[PDB]
Amino acid sequence: KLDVFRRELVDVEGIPLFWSIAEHWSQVESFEARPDDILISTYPKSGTTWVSEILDLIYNNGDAEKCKRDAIYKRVPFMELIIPGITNGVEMLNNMPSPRIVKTHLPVQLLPSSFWKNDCKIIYVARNAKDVVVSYYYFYQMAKIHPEPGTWEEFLEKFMAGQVSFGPWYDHVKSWWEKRKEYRILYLFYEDMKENPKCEIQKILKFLEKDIPEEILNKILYHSSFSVMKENPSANYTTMMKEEMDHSVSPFMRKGISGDWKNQFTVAQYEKFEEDYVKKMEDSTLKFRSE
Numbered sequence: 001k002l003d004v005f006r007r008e009l010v011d012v013e014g015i016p017l018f019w020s021i022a023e024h025w026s027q028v029e030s031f032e033a034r035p036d037d038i039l040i041s042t043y044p045k046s047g048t049t050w051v052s053e054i055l056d057l058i059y060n061n062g063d064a065e066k067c068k069r070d071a072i073y074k075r076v077p078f079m080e081l082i083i084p085g086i087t088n089g090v091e092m093l094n095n096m097p098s099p100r101i102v103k104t105h106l107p108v109q110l111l112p113s114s115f116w117k118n119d120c121k122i123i124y125v126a127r128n129a130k131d132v133v134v135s136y137y138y139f140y141q142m143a144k145i146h147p148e149p150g151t152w153e154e155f156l157e158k159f160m161a162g163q164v165s166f167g168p169w170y171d172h173v174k175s176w177w178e179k180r181k182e183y184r185i186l187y188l189f190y191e192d193m194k195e196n197p198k199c200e201i202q203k204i205l206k207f208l209e210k211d212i213p214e215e216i217l218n219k220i221l222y223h224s225s226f227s228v229m230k231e232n233p234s235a236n237y238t239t240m241m242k243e244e245m246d247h248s249v250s251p252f253m254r255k256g257i258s259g260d261w262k263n264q265f266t267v268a269q270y271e272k273f274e275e276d277y278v279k280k281m282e283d284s285t286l287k288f289r290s291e
């Protein structure tokens, strides 16, 4: 009888989250981090899976077979994602041996304080807002834990208002940016990874204090490319129950480009978005590319 899908979001400290995360908030808030945890932190649809696969590849020295030991969401648990009878990110992590790779979409002010207290290395990934909202729309459609997104037009308005899962993109990226010097945060951009993935992976290795052979670097580059990941059942979310993710609605590995916003936004929608965007972002030193 209990339908866990398509419910309205429930606010935690003003941030709309899945009802089942809000229900289990004490478990998330009290999460016990470890000094050698690496946290992958992103606003939804910003490159989480890409960087997760990259990290697991680095940790397994480019061994593609070892990285097929399980689905990406088992290999790199989504910490706060808890759905009764289905999943519990905190429980999965509690029982995982170090070194753990941890996924989160929490804004800075909701991150379990144990990560700060343990001085964990954090890789944050940001992506231009317009591309994020396009990707998030199709994700809302296929990932049934989310509320119904409605029309593109309706969804875009909700996104601008921050009335979407994990709250406003604007606050999310800005506050993580502002935090970047306080803690061990590597702040990456999806568009940079698109333009020069080798450069970006090299930044990741230096941040992790890992040296690998050139051949292994090239292996990691290949296996983390969109075309390979899209065809990889261990990375493409096709192992999810259809009831949770319906890829016939929209595949998780959708396009993997920068600039798809130009295909989704009408000119009127774009003009309204940019006027709003400038107001919200003009006081931040953060700079994005959108193509």
Ligand SMILES: Nc1ncnc2c1ncn2[C@@H]1O[C@H](COP(=O)(O)OS(=O)(=O)O)[C@@H](OP(=O)(O)O)[C@H]1O
Residues within 6 Å of the ligand: 042, 043, 044, 045, 046, 047, 048, 049, 050, 131, 134, 135, 136, 138, 224, 225, 226, 227, 229, 252, 253, 254, 255, 256, 257, 260
């Ligand atoms: N390897 C690789 N290269 C390039 N792009 C990639 C890759 N893997 C995933 N993607 C694209 O990233 C979008 C998914 O974002 P996330 O992984 O952050 O989604 S989630 O928040 O974890 O659910 C989603 O973007 P869109 O294609 O624009 O929808 C994915 O297609």
